[PDB]
């Protein structure tokens, strides 16, 4: 049994992959909807990797998920075969 607290972005993991894992685990978490909102508002940025965390903090709390994805595109990457 996993916990949302256990979900952290990998050192080179694409932000898009991490958000998907965060979402899947949060859906299964046993907590109120109000708490799930708070977990998303705080833990998603807090448990991002250092390079994405910097970017997300700069964007600020008004940013949309789509905007966060665009800002973190290619961080850790670009993940093409050599």
């Amino acid at each position: 049994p996993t916990s949302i607290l256990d979900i952290r972005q990998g050192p080179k993991e694409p932000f898009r992959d991490y958000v998907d894992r965060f979402y899947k685990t949060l859906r299964a978490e046993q907590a109120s909807q109000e708490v799930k909102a708070w977990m998303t508002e705080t833990l998603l940025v807090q448990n991002a990797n250092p390079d994405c965390k910097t970017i997300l903090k700069a964007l600020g709390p008004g940013a949309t998920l789509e905007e966060m994805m665009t800002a973190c595109q290619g961080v850790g990457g670009p993940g093409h075969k050599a």
Binding site: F22, Y23, Q33, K36, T40, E41, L44
Partner: peptide, 12 residues
């Protein structure tokens, strides 16, 4: 962002 934002993004 909120949990509802994740639901919208990956859902309905």
């Amino acid at each position: 962002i909120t949990f509802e934002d994740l639901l919208d993004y990956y859902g309905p």
